[PDB]
Amino acid sequence: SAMIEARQVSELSTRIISSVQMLSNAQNEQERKEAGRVLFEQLESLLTHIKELGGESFDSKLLDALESNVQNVINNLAELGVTVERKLWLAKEIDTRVEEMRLLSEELEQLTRTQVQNTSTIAVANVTHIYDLLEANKKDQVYQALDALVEVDLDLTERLHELHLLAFKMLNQIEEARTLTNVDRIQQIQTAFENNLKIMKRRVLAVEDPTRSKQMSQLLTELGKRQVVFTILLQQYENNEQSQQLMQKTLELFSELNSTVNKLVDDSNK
Amino acid sequence: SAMIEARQVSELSTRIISSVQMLSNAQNEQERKEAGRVLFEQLESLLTHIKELGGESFDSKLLDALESNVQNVINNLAELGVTVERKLWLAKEIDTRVEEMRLLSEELEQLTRTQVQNTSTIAVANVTHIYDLLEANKKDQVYQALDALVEVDLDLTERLHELHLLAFKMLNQIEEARTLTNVDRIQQIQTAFENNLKIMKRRVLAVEDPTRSKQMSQLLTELGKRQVVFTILLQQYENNEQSQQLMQKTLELFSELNSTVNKLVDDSNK
Amino acid sequence: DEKICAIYPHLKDSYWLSVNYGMVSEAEKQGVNLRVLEAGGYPNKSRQEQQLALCTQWGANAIILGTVDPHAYEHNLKSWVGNTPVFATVNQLDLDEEQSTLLKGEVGVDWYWMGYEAGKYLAERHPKGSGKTNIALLLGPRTKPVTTGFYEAIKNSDIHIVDSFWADNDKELQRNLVQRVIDMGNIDYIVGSAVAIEAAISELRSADKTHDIGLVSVYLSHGVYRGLLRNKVLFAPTDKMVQQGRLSVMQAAHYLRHQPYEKQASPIIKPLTPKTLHDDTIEESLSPSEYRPTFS
Amino acid sequence: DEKICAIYPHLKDSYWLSVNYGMVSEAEKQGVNLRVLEAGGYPNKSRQEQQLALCTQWGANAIILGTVDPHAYEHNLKSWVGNTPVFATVNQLDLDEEQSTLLKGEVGVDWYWMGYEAGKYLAERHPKGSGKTNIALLLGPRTKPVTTGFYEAIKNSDIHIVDSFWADNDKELQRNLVQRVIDMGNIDYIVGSAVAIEAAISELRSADKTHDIGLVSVYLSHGVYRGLLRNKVLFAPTDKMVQQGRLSVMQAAHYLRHQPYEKQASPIIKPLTPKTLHDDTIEESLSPSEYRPTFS
């Protein structure tokens, strides 16, 4: 009757594994609740059988090595079931935190575009003015106007294009961040975002324009704060790594469990 | 003696699975050559044993159902071992094809920056000229100069900033493409790259500047061609999807195989 | 000092930069504490909703609002501003009877008349039987007042609208269309938005087609203005952008200070041609040169 | 017509735009078929290598080359151009004895003398014992000829170099440094690259510190020039960028047409101050206005 349970165990062992894999590749807090809930029942069975088979022998050394193999297998499915739990949370967090950052970065991109825009209009307004000065033959004020056109407008038009270019890059980064799975890229974008943010923070402070500099410095310090989204972007990866090692562990444990349920199916042959 | 092989099979079954998983998560054409080469030997053993056990019974219905279960398990490890083979190739292709595109996109970004640059210098040169015209009291030519400053320079400065902004976006896309694992993002970037490329291709044709328009139109048509990198970026995903389903199949097949090696361990009890 | 919080759809063009100037200028003369906020642009509905709410938290005694969409806030205004007084500007802000409680004033212009004025210019230039004339219509985004009025003033005028192209109101988009028009080469005039005429000015110089295609703007802006000043444009109506800005502040100030004020004020549209740019007329339309966007 | 293929490190500044003009201008007068190529910028080594190779495939009879790095091609030139004749321009192109086979000519200027000239200006402005004077040094990227020569002309001159800042030669980078200098506020002059002086012109206006800090450029460009013209700059030397461009074409043409030519030509540096901008002197330094980058 020990062979009756042994095979019964070897049989349920396989269905368990295919239930953990299933648990692993679960997506919402439903496919998780399921692939796991059945993982549960399948386990309570591996136990009833592992228990009965636990009577067909009384070898101290083996009965303990069995009690042990079953716990390890249980803690594993446990730690793994928690990982798939933590995964769903990280995804929820990241997707949330990113979008927050996007709305900000997008505001900043538009706020810098808006300024590039204004500089043009004003340059045109500024040139129109020169036509008047020129008419009235106020030749000095003309020279002075042309000076400003260069020392101020043409110079600002460039500084702002440059600034808007960064805000644009900084946005593109936040857009790629939400679906970043590759660890090296997460590494790269993180420090790139950190460096960009820094020069950006400095370029704005120098721009002589009250309300606008504050607006931007604010947006920047705010984005700077949600910068941690990158750390948690790593944990995502770090955790999926775990989730995979655990799975590979499950196999060694089930192998070890049976390599013992077998040594046990004997002794009842003595 | 049939129980001697049955357990022997159940034992090697587990070590095989953990060898396919290992094969799966292989990276260079070496960890592949290995995790698989041992997958091979472990298989040639599952066979010697599955063969001997093939003698302890002569039930036509079962002996055939066994011959069948073993082939399916073999074709599987086979199809899977080919997938991990195709994977390494796709990675090699993509990483290559992307970099090709990057060098081009980067050239285009610099070529458009270079033009923004020139427009400034010329605006300054153009304004300097007005100082002379103003001196000589050639008041007409001054008005005309101011006209050009607006109708041509200030207008070009914007058109080019806009163009350089696209080339910048188009580059950022190619930089994210090489580590794109997420299918939806690959979908998005692909059509985004396709749409951008199109307007870009049009904006340049209108820019009145001989050598430069050709240069860019060339770079653009060239990038347009390596656009397929996106399709193969999907195959990457499409293939990794396969590779995972196959793994889940391996379990059902090994389960089915033993669910038969067991029904077979009997009949030798008759 | 009373706190007035203005809110624009955006502040990236000659128009609103000019409205801004008047709002800021009057806000000074009127002796009130101003604070202006600009949404990201017309498609930024959410942003403006929060700005409306932000204006309230700031403790605005009165809120001037340039809707980002007419029918927005129609059944929500109070859930954003609460019980604060709102004065519409430039854009039509229509609200349901329950929400219309807050509307203490409106400043604007019927854009039908803007297009009409442009239409009338062309009509008198080419009356019935004086000779068929071809037009292109770059009026922007997709019935529209500007369009309707333009058509009404054309009715019975030997002027023919060959084709009509629409596209967002972005420079590079209009420029594209303008070029499309230059290629069909059988047109004599391009009636379009200020941004399109602006584009056409350069495009027509580049293509040397100046003197071959006349430009008529459907509204004013620095650029279209400077274009007029330098005979690069034929006509443009002005709806006094600067003045609309003042009026709105005046309303709000008067209301709070319990003074008399037209509940529905609106400047008087005025036609502009190169030989008729009257100083006092533009001073109430466009912001001065060098003047930069001010927010308080 | 002989085919001459020129190759620059880049073509994004006043300098090379000016070299380009001369190369294109002479190339016309000289009656040869020109084709110019520009690397992405100085850090683009690979790109230039392929352009060199591309020039050969084009069948260049002669190749003018503005190295992206002196020691590059030092032991490879032939593996890129083959057996084609190369003429160095602007930048020093040194090759090993085996590769020096191709060097049919060199056009350039010793930049030590550029910095020297700027140095000399300041030295005569403040001789020994006339009163301590403080300088800032924004010379760009990290011994350097410009620096060395500037120091040699300062030696024994009551002029003190308070601090020295380096950074790439980008406008926004120099601007940053310029601002850093304005804050330590105990400086009287800023000797820097044309791009830095250009930046300082605006920064000093913005900070109203004009008339408080003098600007000395270590080389010329439109902008630094216009800055001189309008007394916003005190001094700048010119190494005749336009002329260097001509000379190089002249060499190449003469060589191929078996004519006499200086194997190592170099224009004559000339000092520039607001009251001394001689037409013929700038005509050989800066490209004309409106002139746009030409590649054939």
**Closest residue on chain A to C295 (Cα):** A211
C-beta of residue B145 within 8 angstroms of C-beta of residue B133: yes
Q: Please state the length of chain D.
A: 296
Q: What is the number of CB-based contacts under 8 A between chain B and chain D?
A: 62
**D293/B118 touch (CB, cutoff 8 Å), yes or no:** yes
Question: Measured between alpha carbons, how far is C259 from C2 in angstroms, rounded to an integer?
Answer: 14
C-beta of residue D89 within 8 angstroms of C-beta of residue D127: no
Domain boundaries, chain C: 1-109+239-268, 110-238+269-296
Helix (H, G, I), strand (E, B) or coil at C167: coil
Give the amino acid at C21: Y
C-beta of residue D213 within 8 angstroms of C-beta of residue D190: yes
Task: Kindly list the residues from chain B whose CB atom is less than 8 angstroms away from the CB atom of residue A254.
Answer: 14
Contact partners of A by the rule of 3+ C-beta pairs under 8 A? B, C, D
**C11/A114 touch (CB, cutoff 8 Å), yes or no:** yes
For testing contact with chain A, the best of B1, B4, B5, B7 (most A CBs within 10 A): B7
Q: Does A143 touch chain D (CB under 8 A)?
A: yes
Query: Residue written as tokens 């990866």?
Result: A237
CATH numeric code, D110-238+269-296: 3.40.50.2300
User: DSSP string covering chain D, please?
Assistant: --EEEEEES---SHHHHHHHHHHHHHHHHTT-EEEEEE-SSTT-HHHHHHHHHHHHHTT-SEEEE--SSTTTTTTTTHHHHTT--EEE-SS-----TTTTTSEEEEE---HHHHHHHHHHHHHHHS-TTS--EEEEEEEE----HHHHHHHHHHSSSSEEEEEEEE--S-HHHHHHHHHHHHHT---SEEEE-HHHHHHHHHHHHHTS-TTTSEEEESS--TTHHHHHHTTS--BEEE--HHHHHHHHHHHHHHHHTT----TEE----EEE-GGG--HHHHHTTSPPSS------
Question: Min CA distance, B184 vs chain A (Å)?
Answer: 9
Task: Kindly list the residues from chain B whose CB atom is less than 8 angstroms away from the CB atom of residue A143.
Answer: 131, 134
Q: Which is nearest to C167 in space by CA: C190, C144, C196? A: C196
Please name the residues in contact with C218: beta carbons below 8 A apart, sequence gap of 6 or more: C114, C115, C118, C139, C146, C150, C191, C192, C193, C194, C236, C237
**D11/B118 touch (CB, cutoff 8 Å), yes or no:** yes
Q: Which helix (H) or strand (E) holds B221?
A: helix B210-225
Write out the CATH class of domain D1-109+239-268: alpha beta
Task: Kindly list the residues from chain D whose CB atom is less than 8 angstroms away from the CB atom of residue B128.
Answer: 222, 225-226, 229, 289
**CATH numbers and ranges of domains, chain A:** 1-270 (1.20.58.920)
Task: Kindly list the residues from chain C whose CB atom is less than 8 angstroms away from the CB atom of residue B150.
Answer: 226
Q: Does B151 touch chain C (CB under 8 A)?
A: yes
Question: Measured between alpha carbons, how far is C288 from B123 in angstroms, rounded to an integer?
Answer: 23
Q: How is residue C168 written in tokens?
A: 């967002």
Do the first three CATH levels of D1-109+239-268 and D110-238+269-296 match, i.e. the same topology?
A: yes
> For D167, phi and psi rounded to 5 degrees?
180, 160
By what technique were these coordinates determined?
X-ray
C-beta of residue C106 within 8 angstroms of C-beta of residue C85: no
Q: What number of other Cβ atoms are within 10 A of residue A145's Cβ?
A: 20
**Closest residue on chain A to D179 (Cα):** A206
Task: Kindly list the residues from chain D whose CB atom is less than 8 angstroms away from the CB atom of residue B209.
Answer: 292
Please name the residues in contact with A185: beta carbons below 8 A apart, sequence gap of 6 or more: B176, B179
**C202/B155 touch (CB, cutoff 8 Å), yes or no:** yes
**Closest residue on chain B to D46 (Cα):** B103
**D179/A158 touch (CB, cutoff 8 Å), yes or no:** no
Query: Residue written as tokens 């011994």?
Result: D143
Resolution rounded to one decimal, in angstroms: 3.1
Q: Identify any residues that bridge with D161 across adjacent strands, giving them in sequence order.
A: D135
Among the partner residues C10, C11, C290, nearest to A126 by beta-carbon distance: C290
Task: Kindly list the residues from chain D whose CB atom is less than 8 angstroms away from the CB atom of residue B106.
Answer: 40
Question: Measured between alpha carbons, how far is D210 from C50 in angstroms, rounded to an integer?
Answer: 44
